[PDB]
Write an enzyme that holds these catalytic residues in place. Structure first.
Site, PDB file in Angstrom:
ATOM      1  N   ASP A 110     -17.340  26.645 -11.444  1.00 34.39           N
ATOM      2  CA  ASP A 110     -17.318  25.704 -12.570  1.00 34.39           C
ATOM      3  C   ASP A 110     -16.261  25.949 -13.654  1.00 34.39           C
ATOM      4  OD1 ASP A 110     -18.100  23.771 -14.406  1.00 34.39           O
ATOM      5  OD2 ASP A 110     -20.161  24.451 -14.548  1.00 34.39           O
ATOM      6  N   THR A 111     -15.175  25.175 -13.614  1.00 36.46           N
ATOM      7  CA  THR A 111     -14.082  25.289 -14.606  1.00 36.46           C
ATOM      8  C   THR A 111     -14.486  24.781 -15.998  1.00 36.46           C
ATOM      9  OG1 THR A 111     -13.200  23.122 -14.043  1.00 36.46           O
ATOM     10  CG2 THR A 111     -12.328  25.042 -12.833  1.00 36.46           C
ATOM     11  N   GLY A 112     -15.595  24.053 -16.073  1.00 35.88           N
ATOM     12  CA  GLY A 112     -16.071  23.533 -17.346  1.00 35.88           C
ATOM     13  C   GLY A 112     -17.058  24.458 -18.046  1.00 35.88           C
TER      14      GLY A 112
HETATM   15  C1  LIG Z   1     -18.677  21.168 -21.270  1.00 31.17           C
HETATM   16  C2  LIG Z   1     -20.176  20.950 -21.411  1.00 31.17           C
HETATM   17  C3  LIG Z   1     -20.515  19.508 -21.767  1.00 31.17           C
HETATM   18  C4  LIG Z   1     -20.861  21.360 -20.103  1.00 31.17           C
HETATM   19  C5  LIG Z   1     -20.612  22.802 -19.702  1.00 31.17           C
HETATM   20  N1  LIG Z   1     -21.540  23.015 -18.582  1.00 31.17           N
HETATM   21  C6  LIG Z   1     -20.881  23.138 -17.270  1.00 31.17           C
HETATM   22  C7  LIG Z   1     -20.821  21.813 -16.505  1.00 31.17           C
HETATM   23  O1  LIG Z   1     -19.913  21.955 -15.413  1.00 31.17           O
HETATM   24  C8  LIG Z   1     -22.205  21.416 -15.976  1.00 31.17           C
HETATM   25  C9  LIG Z   1     -22.683  22.408 -14.906  1.00 31.17           C
HETATM   26  C10 LIG Z   1     -23.985  21.991 -14.243  1.00 31.17           C
HETATM   27  C11 LIG Z   1     -25.203  22.055 -14.927  1.00 31.17           C
HETATM   28  C12 LIG Z   1     -26.375  21.668 -14.321  1.00 31.17           C
HETATM   29  C13 LIG Z   1     -26.329  21.219 -13.016  1.00 31.17           C
HETATM   30  C14 LIG Z   1     -25.144  21.145 -12.327  1.00 31.17           C
HETATM   31  C15 LIG Z   1     -23.990  21.527 -12.938  1.00 31.17           C
HETATM   32  O2  LIG Z   1     -27.452  20.842 -12.342  1.00 31.17           O
HETATM   33  C16 LIG Z   1     -28.408  19.969 -12.910  1.00 31.17           C
HETATM   34  C17 LIG Z   1     -28.307  18.583 -12.302  1.00 31.17           C
HETATM   35  C18 LIG Z   1     -27.153  17.822 -12.908  1.00 31.17           C
HETATM   36  C19 LIG Z   1     -25.984  17.712 -11.972  1.00 31.17           C
HETATM   37  C20 LIG Z   1     -25.108  16.567 -12.413  1.00 31.17           C
HETATM   38  C21 LIG Z   1     -23.865  17.038 -13.147  1.00 31.17           C
HETATM   39  O3  LIG Z   1     -22.837  17.249 -12.520  1.00 31.17           O
HETATM   40  N2  LIG Z   1     -23.965  17.256 -14.458  1.00 31.17           N
HETATM   41  C22 LIG Z   1     -22.803  17.689 -15.252  1.00 31.17           C
HETATM   42  C23 LIG Z   1     -22.442  16.626 -16.319  1.00 31.17           C
HETATM   43  C24 LIG Z   1     -21.349  17.148 -17.234  1.00 31.17           C
HETATM   44  C25 LIG Z   1     -21.991  15.330 -15.647  1.00 31.17           C
HETATM   45  C26 LIG Z   1     -22.942  19.067 -15.925  1.00 31.17           C
HETATM   46  O4  LIG Z   1     -23.712  19.232 -16.884  1.00 31.17           O
HETATM   47  N3  LIG Z   1     -22.187  20.043 -15.423  1.00 31.17           N
HETATM   48  S1  LIG Z   1     -22.956  23.817 -18.840  1.00 31.17           S
HETATM   49  O5  LIG Z   1     -23.748  23.066 -19.805  1.00 31.17           O
HETATM   50  O6  LIG Z   1     -23.683  23.928 -17.579  1.00 31.17           O
HETATM   51  C27 LIG Z   1     -22.630  25.322 -19.416  1.00 31.17           C
HETATM   52  C28 LIG Z   1     -22.489  25.559 -20.775  1.00 31.17           C
HETATM   53  C29 LIG Z   1     -22.092  26.816 -21.232  1.00 31.17           C
HETATM   54  C30 LIG Z   1     -21.849  27.834 -20.317  1.00 31.17           C
HETATM   55  N4  LIG Z   1     -21.406  29.074 -20.725  1.00 31.17           N
HETATM   56  C31 LIG Z   1     -21.997  27.606 -18.968  1.00 31.17           C
HETATM   57  C32 LIG Z   1     -22.389  26.353 -18.526  1.00 31.17           C
END
Ligand SMILES: CC(C)CCN(C[C@@H](O)[C@@H]1Cc2ccc(cc2)OCCCCCC(=O)N[C@@H](C(C)C)C(=O)N1)S(=O)(=O)c1ccc(N)cc1
Lengths: 99, 99
Positions: B25-27
């Protein structure tokens, strides 16, 4: 271009004639943009992430220019902490992860 | 290797002697692993994403093998729906985004 990950992979995109900064996010299935005015019809939808689900407006077949590369696809508009370019548009510009 | 984005970029990682599937995950700024009883001292932290914030335990200098590549750094443990390898460890295995 080849982008390293020491800093957040933020790039300028052009959507609806407007310029904006967005994060290239390989962990996002979809593309979610902060609340803004986009022409055309939209359908209400819900998307999930780490903290739960949010309500977004779904716009179909929207042209988006990412660092000079063209994509046309679905863009979700809603209360996101940052503009996110997800796999749906990254695949169109031929983006890959390499190591 | 070169990973395309037609499907979620999931790979096998090794952490705490265990094998798990995780999303490249690059995000994600930091790496977030699903609930597991890792030994060691930790500090509480809150990370926010699309639906809001979740409380996690921050562990430092945890060795993590990613697709046979050794890395070591901060790992956040909490109620995440999926294991996430973030930029903090991706930069260690020389991963880049290319288009
Ligand atoms: C930039 C910010 C808006 C989001 C940063 N995030 C990473 C982002 O790639 C996350 C990673 C993630 C989380 C849950 C998941 C699947 C992937 O499964 C549930 C089921 C949801 C999957 C659908 C999806 O791709 N959701 C994305 C959304 C932005 C369209 C999403 O939230 N992607 S995070 O919230 O997961 C995150 C935050 C901080 C840290 N340090 C690590 C991770």
């Amino acid at each position: 271009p080849q982008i390293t990950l020491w800093k957040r992979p933020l790039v300028t995109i052009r959507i609806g004639g407007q310029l904006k900064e967005a994060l290239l996010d390989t962990g996002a299935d979809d593309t979610v943009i902060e609340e803004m005015n986009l022409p055309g019809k939209w359908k209400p939808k819900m998307i999930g992430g780490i903290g739960g689900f949010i309500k977004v407006r779904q716009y179909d077949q929207i042209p988006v220019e990412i660092a000079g590369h063209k994509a046309i696809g679905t863009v979700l508009v809603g209360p996101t902490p940052v503009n996110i370019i997800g796999r749906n548009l990254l695949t169109q510009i031929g983006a890959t992860l390499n190591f």
